Design a protein around this ligand. Sequence first.
Ligand SMILES: [Cl-]
Ligand SMILES: [Sr+2]
Ligand SMILES: [Sr+2]
Length: 476
Amino acid sequence: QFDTNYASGRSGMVHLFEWKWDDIAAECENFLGPNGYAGVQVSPVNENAVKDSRPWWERYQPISYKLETRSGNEEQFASMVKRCNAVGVRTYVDVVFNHMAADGGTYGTGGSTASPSSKSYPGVPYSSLDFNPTCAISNYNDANEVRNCELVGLRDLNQGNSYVQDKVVEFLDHLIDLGVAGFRVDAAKHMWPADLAVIYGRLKNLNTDHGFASGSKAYIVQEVIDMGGEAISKSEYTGLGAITEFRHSDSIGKVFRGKDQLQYLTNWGTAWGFAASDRSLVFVDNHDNQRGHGAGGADVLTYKVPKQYKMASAFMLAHPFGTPRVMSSFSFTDTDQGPPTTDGHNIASPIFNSDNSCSGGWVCEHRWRQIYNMVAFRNTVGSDEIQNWWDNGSNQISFSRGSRGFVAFNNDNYDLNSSLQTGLPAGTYCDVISGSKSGSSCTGKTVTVGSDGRASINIGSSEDDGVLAIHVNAKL
Ligand SMILES: [Cl-]
Ligand SMILES: [Sr+2]
Ligand SMILES: [Sr+2]
């Protein structure tokens, strides 16, 4: 429940938010695999309610557990999981079993229907007996209300009923049979850990035909928003699996926006209120808070603030704490709008420019060189500890990961032009933020490390990027 089941030498779980299964399978073979990424978090794979204008959040209103969505059907999903596993990229499913669709959700994405007004969902065989008595959540200081009442009108399932446990376990086991590596448990805060323990403990072992070692169990990351001041703490879940560490997203946004100083990053980790490193999924933003949903912090950094977004992403990917998840978005100016479509309904596949960047309504942050090259950085440094920490007491910092990678940041309003200790072997390195190693040369900036380990590091405050990174797997 705690091991990611990543393949060897890989890091980074990309949330391919609202992507179709066929497009993910291609992306695994064309990009994610060859660029050392470790996994893909998919949108909910089960049938959801069809809502007017097809908002993104319609997928969090389950109608059945049949694998029929705007992303594809079961055959397309199964083929994607196989094709992704074959190139070393794992699949993690956003599973939604706190609730069923709310009132108005009559039609499902796979042809099923439902009567949420009567709590009747004939696709899951669900009836009103399978739900908690109707009430609304308002007081997050009442743990009983948070877990037993309806979240924004979504019909609240009773996971204490053995029939509901059976239906959920059957659904998750089915996904395991198809080769998934783990699950992102939606609204875990709104369910009782005792019931989740029963569901988690019943899941079968992972499918060894997809390359998982014998005895492997599903990775469990639980969506628990714990900013403090409420009745439910993330510590109620860290014994059953990992948790979504939203303090990381909030703090890293404040720090790299300039609301806090980079010099304080010297004790990044539990000293900032985070859960344990081996229990924390970290991210710069997620599909909720990039949109003002969920925690909804205005200091969250998104692709819309690109320079500081890449700096925070680079710091996350360079830092040993936690398990990083890399957001991948579609462009939006409305917090309800769904993914791009060809006709208002059919999701439009991403298209690619001459430089392999995304277009057609998709951002593909995972295809930004400053981000995927930092995945390569993370892969090169392994488990090496932070060394050679330096800062100017404000917003200029640098450090190495052992003797294998070095990173430097400038968030001050003046230039950084300093000889810094990199801890790396002497030689000529390609800055992987501004470019890549290509043959025996660099496409962007070059960094020369002398015999004493020091190098001239130059990051102008007005440059497009405010981070520089070098590592031994991009050395001339
Ligand atoms: Cl999440
Ligand atoms: Sr509940
Ligand atoms: Sr200091």
